[PDB]
Amino acid sequence: RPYACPVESCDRRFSDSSNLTRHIRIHTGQKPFQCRICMRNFSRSDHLTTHIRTHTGEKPFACDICGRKFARSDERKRHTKIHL
DNA sequence: AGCGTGGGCGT
DNA sequence: TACGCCCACGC
Ligand SMILES: [Zn+2]
Ligand SMILES: [Zn+2]
Ligand SMILES: [Zn+2]
């Protein structure tokens, strides 16, 4: 890629200066997005969003076959296969 | 099952 | 870069 990981112990390459900025967070341990409910910190805004659904019980993704609801699209994806 | 969490990638 | 999602892992 056009960007690399400067930490000597690590050797990953990143597409751009924010996938690199994002990745660097693993090393800096920065968790800039906090859950106002349990006060837990997260490295990503998208992961905080879905985390919050564990408190509220919001489940936006329903299975096409049986209708069971899930908080994340990947959980639904993992579930749908059971109908085979 | 419940979900943390990194990477690819589109806007 | 920030954001959001899809994906794929991992426990
Ligand atoms: Zn690294
Ligand atoms: Zn929380
Ligand atoms: Zn189903």
CATH code at position A37: 3.30.160.60
Measure A23 CA to B7 C1' (Å). 9
C-alpha A46 to ligand 3 mean position (Å): 25
Q: How far is CA A32 from CA A3, A51, A58, in A?
A: 23, 14, 23
- A36 and A53: one domain? yes
Report the amino acid identity of residue A44.
Answer: R
A78 lies in which domain range? 58-84
Query: What's the distance, CA A13 to chain centroid?
Result: 20
Which bases of chain C are contacted by protein, using any atom under 7 A from a CB?
A: 1-9
Structural method? X-ray
Alpha helices in chain A (DSSP H): 19-28, 45-56, 73-80
What is the 3-state composition of chain A as percent helix, strand, coil, each rounded to the nearest 5?
40, 10, 50
Measure A2 CA to B1 C1' (Å). 40
- A2 and A26: one domain? yes
- A26 and A50: one domain? no
The number of domains in chain A is 3
